[PDB]
Design a protein around this ligand. Sequence first.
Ligand SMILES: O=C(NCCc1ccc(O)cc1)c1ccccn1
Length: 185
Amino acid sequence: HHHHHHMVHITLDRNTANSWLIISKDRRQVRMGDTHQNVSDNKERFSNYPMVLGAQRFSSGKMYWEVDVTQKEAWDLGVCRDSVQRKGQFSLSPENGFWTIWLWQDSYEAGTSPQTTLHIQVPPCQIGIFVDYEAGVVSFYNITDHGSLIYTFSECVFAGPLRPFFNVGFNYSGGNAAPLKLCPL
Ligand SMILES: O=C(NCCc1ccc(O)cc1)c1ccccn1
């Protein structure tokens, strides 16, 4: 792809984080802690899952960023509406305001309803995410495999400002402690 020139500098919004997440000083990395991280609760925090939003809001234009997923067993990545549900149980779907892909139990899937199987020959260590607001497109790229396309959501109905979306996943196995990292431009 040739989307790299739309690169944006994403930072994580501490106030939206699940209370077990640990965000680095530079707000560019996040991992699952082994306990509650001693923060107050608020209506913005994701309660049920290890999720956090980017601070940046997008309502127009073309945006691109990259995320490092090295040595993770489970994660979700993409964008979501600013007004997505934060509390209780929900599925990641465009009907609920999410445009995402994930790794789970050694398979990759797009967060459609129902979910769509992805075909990845080279397990990615870094994911590129492209958003074209006006066109209604969210695309995912395999940076480890020379930028090959993973998935395109088209005919998106964003219906609000968008925020970068992250889920570091649970670590029940002891094999999923590694962080998500926003990669440098
Ligand atoms: O699991 C990982 N590191 C643990 C992070 C940590 C744990 C405890 C602590 O006190 C401070 C830092 C990892 C990091 C990079 C790639 C893969 N795995």
